């Protein structure tokens, strides 16, 4: 049940993919730590919530 | 792979494509990049937004309560041999303001408890190490009337027994909301006055409050019987949201909080003075 | 070539049509068009009523006048429509109700008038009260119906601690709720800037932390219209022009039928 | 185990 | 019904989802969920109060 | 074997259920179950509202008492339901409305009581007036709502030719309209004969010379309940037992929405 | 001897079957924790303990 | 190990 993932390495020693290991010890998922491997999204629903979305090179009002 | 987009090289323009002009009346933000209005070079971008994900913005224990509880001889007056705290993030301001960038949220909650004690009197002997009971009393369960009545038997409510000097206690709680998300803002009432009501008190309720007891209370006591010298303790509670999702962003609080609603009262002047043409 | 423009629109719902020849495109809040509760998101088990064209049609509220000293107007939904035809009847006969809305705000002037209105649609628009007592605005005062309310330039605390008014005191640059008005642009919005357009159209999905709720107890959306730039004309000091708000329920469904709710407003 |  | 076999009757039992005036007359009660029970050889009648709620769970 | 009987029925419509353990089967008038207007029989072109469970449910009218001197009762449809919940609201907000009905008449007594009620459903039940003036019953008097009207044993002509009552004078053996009561059996009907059954159930299709009409101006069906054999019990001379009428709209559709009709009844 | 099972996840992070691991360390089964993976049953032995169980649409007394 |  060990999950092995890659670390995003910042400073490098003068010594490659370094991995880390996680095992969940509890049945309830609320006990789990955060994996912090989080995806993102498009801001459009806030920055461009327009019915006809127009291209930035074209006039906004036609 | 999580880096932000690369800057593209772009050169001069003389054309009918005009990205610099727009109409903000439409409700949209103009998605320009520097290469739309200046000549840019190519830059391989390596920066990322790893630390501003919703999980990383909330991934800190924030203090939400300081509960004081004493261990001394039970006298006949009002004492603090046990204390009760109604669970909330609105007794402090810092975590409240970060959660209120959003209207709704869904998360699990980690509570860590830091306990400190001290003597109050110069000397009436000493005290042996104290054990603390933190009992969760959900809405509806009986609340203690004295520090050792039957409710502390805790057969169904969860309790933590913490030993002084041990590492801070810590537990996690699931998403326990009655709805599909927690509401940080509720524009409404729990009751409606009807025309046929006998009097006006019947349908009156507080604006923007939902249930009365919300999440219940934490009841804290020192389990030890009293020593001859009095010992005062404080339990500081730190909340950390984990496995966080949030919906509908809001302007952040700009003037001091005045209670659990959105009311304001003083210091309604957040901006300072600066000349229109002063750098 | 044949001539379609994002400035000219026709909206038809039920037996009502709106035309505008000076729009600035239209906003669909949070990119979500309204929809009915899906079976896998359903919670009350009784069969819902869906009045469809009888309630999902445009209702025009009473016109308000924009003058040089106007500070702004606000309405809450579904409250502003509580007395509108069969939408109000279905709202009061049922414990639960759900609805999205098309909001169309109308304000024409001329090529020599100037001014800009900000039209913001805010989920859970909690407003601040008028006194030292917290969360004390009463149900009848929090819910003005189609009349809506107004903003003020400053906090005037109700002092008759004897017969408190229990009203909101929405200060305009604080958006009536303790945040700065300039950041209200994170909410779905349009601007009616008189040199550019004469209307704003915003489509609102149902937003709540529940699939359906009590429409009588809870308002889902607030509409706030504030003069971002004040009205002005020629060199006259008392120009006034109308602002008319027309709103249509969309995808209305109701659950929990029984006798009618009759709130006490007066 | 499961590497990701 | 624990009357004798010779007794007859019809009874309306109703459920009004919240938010309006609590029924004081049959006229108001019959606008909500209801069953009209006819007394007879099947001695008993069941009315089901359907889950009709805004929240996904109510408080006890 | 497991036990189904044409004496025991359950009717469920919307959020309402009726049970009876002493029925005498049920009548579907003219063999036609109610239905919506088909496209090839359609006439108004606007999209109809079909409130479905909000209006097609059982409404119970006020109980009337059957005593030894009762001559009979009559109601008209849709009039008896004009003030019933959202059926009445849809009826008055729309120019046109169409509906079929399930009528359930309830009257229990005991094995020692006797009497027989004739329950008749009559299309276009025109009733006769009280005076020398022809066709003079007024709108408010022709339409009693859920209260219904009564029959008489004889023609009592209104004589106050000054302030005429303008009421119907329905004589019972003439079915209130100049024909003999004994031939009313050509209309869809059941009999509640107390030794046999305690209820009558009749399903009524919409019947009219048009696919849809004004419900406010025109009643499609009349319900007439007359004692074919008078109530009697033990040897008592003043026995009374209740008669309760419960009616449910079926396949309701409405066209021509506008502001609400408010008839003048008083 | 590690047992790996799935957690029933409640709140989800913006990151699937999350598993947890268990090993019993003692010989006596009384030492074990509770697995809480508990099956349920039919209430009929209490709600309908009738010799001839009849269907709800049919009359109870025939 | 034994996944279940
Ligand atoms: C032994 C100690 C157990 C402690 C158990 C605590 C249970 C309650 C956890 C509540 C987390 C609350 C977060 C806030 C939610 C609110 O925003 C909203 N009012 C809900 O609609
Ligand atoms: C997946 O889990 C495969 C096996 C991993 C073996 C190492 C286990 C370390 C101990 C976990 C104990 C959890 C609490 C009983
Ligand atoms: C199944 O158990 C396969 C092997 C699991 C390896 C991890 C063991 C961790 C230590 C268990 C010690 C128990 C007490 C001696």
Map chain C to HEC letters: CCCCCCCCEEEEECCEEEEECCCCCCEEHHHCCCCCCCCCCCCCCCCCECCHHHCCCCEECCCEEEECCCCCEEEEECHHHCCCHHHHHHHHHEEEEEEEEEEEEECCCCCCEEEEEEEEEEECCCCCECCCCCCCCCHHHHCCHHHCEECECCCCCCCCCCCCCCCECCEHHHCCCCCCHHHHHHCCEEEEECCCCCEEEEEECCCCCCCCECCCCECCEEEEEEEEEEEEECCECCCEEEEEEEEEEEEEEEEEECCCCCECCC
Q: Give the sign of the dihedral formed by CA B244, CA B249, CA B253, CA B258.
A: negative
Distance CA(F187)–CA(G33), nearest Å, equals 76
Count Cα neighbours of B3 within 13 Å in the Cβ-side half-sphere. Answer: 9
Distance CA(B181)–CA(C207), nearest Å, equals 11
CB C80 within 8 A of CB C182: no
**Coil, strand or helix at B16:** coil
A51 touching C (Cβ < 8 Å): yes
**Where do the DSSP E strands lie in E1-60?**
10-15, 33-38
CA distance B87 to chain E (A): 17
Q: How far is CA C192 from CA B183, C77, C202, in A?
A: 31, 21, 12
What topology does CATH give the domain A1-62? Rhinovirus 14, subunit 4 (4.10.80)
Q: Which of C259, C226, C202 is nearest to C25 (CA)?
A: C202
CATH number at residue F73: 2.60.120.20
Q: How far is CA B45 from CA A17, B3, B51, B157, B163, in A?
A: 21, 7, 17, 53, 51
* Closest residue to atom 2 of ligand 1, CA basis: B136
Length of chain B: 279
CA distance B106 to chain G (A): 7
Complete domains list, chain B, with CATH: 1-279 (2.60.120.20)
List the determination method.
X-ray
Q: In the B/C pair of chains, how many CB contacts fall below 8 A?
A: 157
G10 touching F (Cβ < 8 Å): no
Maximum pairwise Cα distance, chain F: 69
Q: How far is CA A24 from CA A30, A34, B170, G1, in A?
A: 11, 11, 16, 16
Q: Which of C188, C202, C189, C203 is nearest to C35 (CA)?
A: C203
Give the ligand at the shortest distance from the Cα of G23. 2
Q: A27, G21: Cβ pair inside 8 Å?
A: no
| Angle between helical axes of C85-93 and F85-93 (0-180°, round to 10) | 180
State residue C124 phi and psi, 5-degree precision: 50, 60
**Number of other CB atoms surrounding residue F93 within 10 Å:** 20
A23 touching C (Cβ < 8 Å): no
**What total of structural domains would you count in chain C?**
1
Distance CA(B141)–CA(B151), nearest Å, equals 9
Residues in chain G followed by a break, C to N above 2.5 angstroms? 15
Q: Which of B67, B65, B69 is nearest to B230 (CA)?
A: B69
Count Cα neighbours of C107 within 13 Å in the Cβ-side half-sphere. Answer: 32
Distance CA(F246)–CA(F259), nearest Å, equals 29
Which residues have C-beta atoms less than 6 Å from ligand 1?
Answer: B 87, 89, 109, 111, 134, 136, 158, 160, 171, 173, 176-177, 182-184, 215
**Would you call C225 exposed, middle or buried from its count of C-beta atoms within 10 A (0-12, 13-18, 19+)?**
buried
Distance CA(C35)–CA(C50), nearest Å, equals 12
* Closest residue to atom 20 of ligand 1, CA basis: B182
Distance CA(A27)–CA(A23), nearest Å, equals 12
Give the ligand at the shortest distance from the Cα of B180. 1
G55 touching F (Cβ < 8 Å): yes
The rounded Cα B66 to chain-centroid distance in angstroms is 14
* Closest residue to atom 9 of ligand 3, CA basis: G23
Contacts of F3 (CB under 8 A, 6+ apart): G58, G59, G62
Distance CA(C34)–CA(C202), nearest Å, equals 12
In chain A, count H helices and then E strands.
1, 2
Chain B residues near residue C217 by CB distance under 8 angstroms: 188-192
Distance CA(C243)–CA(C105), nearest Å, equals 7
In chain D, count H helices and then E strands.
0, 1
Domain housing C80: 1-266
Distance CA(F129)–CA(F168), nearest Å, equals 4
Can you read off the two tokens belonging to residue F12? 């469920």
Chain G residues near residue A27 by CB distance under 8 angstroms: 5, 7, 20, 36
Look up tokens 């303001």; give the residue: B97
């Amino acid at each position: 049940g060990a999950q092995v993932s890659s670390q995003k390495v910042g400073a490098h020693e003068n010594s490659s993919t370094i991995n880390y290991t996680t095992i969940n010890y509890y049945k309830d998922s609320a006990s789990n730590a955060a994996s912090k491997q989080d995806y993102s999204q498009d801001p459009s629903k806030f920055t461009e919530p327009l019915k006809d979305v127009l291209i930035k090179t074209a006039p906004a009002l036609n | 792979q999580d880096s932000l987009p690369d800057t593209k090289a772009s050169g001069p323009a003389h054309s009918k494509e005009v990205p610099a002009l727009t109409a903000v009346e439409t409700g949209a933000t103009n998605p320009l990049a520097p290469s739309d209005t200046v000549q840019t070079r190519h830059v391989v971008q390596r920066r990322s937004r790893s630390e501003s994900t919703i999980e990383s913005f909330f991934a800190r224990g924030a203090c939400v309560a300081i509960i004081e509880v004493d261990n001394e001889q039970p006298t006949t007056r009002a004492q603090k041999l046990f204390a009760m705290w109604r669970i909330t993030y609105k007794d402090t301001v810092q975590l409240r303001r970060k959660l209120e960038f959003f209207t709704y949220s869904r998360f699990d909650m980690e509570f860590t408890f830091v306990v400190t004690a001290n003597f109050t009197n110069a000397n009436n002997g000493h005290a042996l190490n104290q054990v603390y009971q933190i009992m969760y009393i959900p809405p509806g369960a009986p609340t203690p009337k004295s520090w050792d009545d039957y409710t502390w038997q805790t057969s169904s409510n969860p309790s933590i027994f913490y030993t002084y000097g041990a590492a801070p206690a810590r537990i996690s709680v699931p998403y326990v909301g009655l709805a599909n998300a927690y509401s940080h803002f509720y524009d409404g009432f729990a009751k409606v006055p009807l025309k046929t009501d006998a009097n006006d008190q019947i349908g009156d309720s507080l604006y923007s409050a939902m249930t009365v007891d919300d999440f219940g209370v934490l009841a804290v006591r020192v389990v030890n019987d009293h020593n001859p010298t009095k010992v005062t303790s404080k339990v500081r509670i730190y909340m950390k949201p984990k496995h966080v999702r949030v919906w509908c962003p809001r302007p952040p609080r700009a003037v001091p909080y005045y209670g659990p609603g959105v009311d304001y009262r003083n210091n309604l002047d957040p901006l300072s003075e600066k000349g229109l043409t002063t750098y | 070539a044949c001539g379609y423009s994002d400035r000219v629109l026709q909206l038809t719902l039920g037996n009502s049509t709106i035309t505008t020849q000076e729009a600035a495109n239209s906003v669909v809040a949070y990119g979500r068009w309204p929809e009915f509760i899906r079976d896998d998101e359903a919670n009350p088990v009784d069969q819902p009523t869906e009045p469809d064209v009888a309630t999902c049609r445009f209702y025009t509220l009473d016109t308000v006048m924009w003058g040089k000293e106007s500070k702004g107007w606000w309405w809450k939904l579904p409250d502003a429509l509580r007395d509108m035809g069969l939408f109000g009847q279905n709202m009061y006969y049922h414990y639960l109700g759900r609805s999205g809305y098309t909001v169309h705000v109308q304000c024409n002037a001329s090529k020599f008038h100037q001014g800009a209105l900000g039209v913001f649609a805010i989920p859970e628009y909690c407003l601040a009260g008028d006194s030292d007592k917290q969360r004390y605005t009463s149900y009848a005062n929090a819910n003005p119906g189609e009349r809506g309310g107004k903003f003020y330039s400053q906090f005037n605390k109700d002092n008759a601690v004897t017969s408190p008014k229990r009203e909101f005191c929405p200060v305009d640059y604080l958006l009536g709720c303790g945040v700065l008005l300039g950041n209200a642009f994170v909410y779905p919005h349009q601007i009616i800037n008189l040199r550019t357009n004469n209307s704003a159209t915003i489509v609102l999905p149902y937003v709540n932390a529940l699939a359906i709720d009590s429409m009588v107890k809870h308002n889902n959306w607030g509409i706030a219209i504030l003069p971002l730039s004040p009205l002005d004309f020629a060199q006259d000091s008392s120009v006034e022009i109308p602002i008319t708000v027309t709103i249509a329920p969309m995808c209305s469904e109701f659950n929990g039928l029984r006798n009618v709710t009759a709130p006490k407003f007066q | 185990i499961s590497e990701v | 019904f624990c009357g004798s076999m010779m007794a007859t009757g019809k009874i309306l039992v109703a459920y009004a989802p919240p938010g309006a005036q609590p029924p004081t007359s049959r006229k108001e009660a019959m606008l909500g969920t209801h069953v009209i029970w006819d007394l007879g050889l099947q001695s008993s009648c069941t009315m089901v109060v359907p889950w009709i709620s805004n929240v996904t769970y109510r408080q006890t």
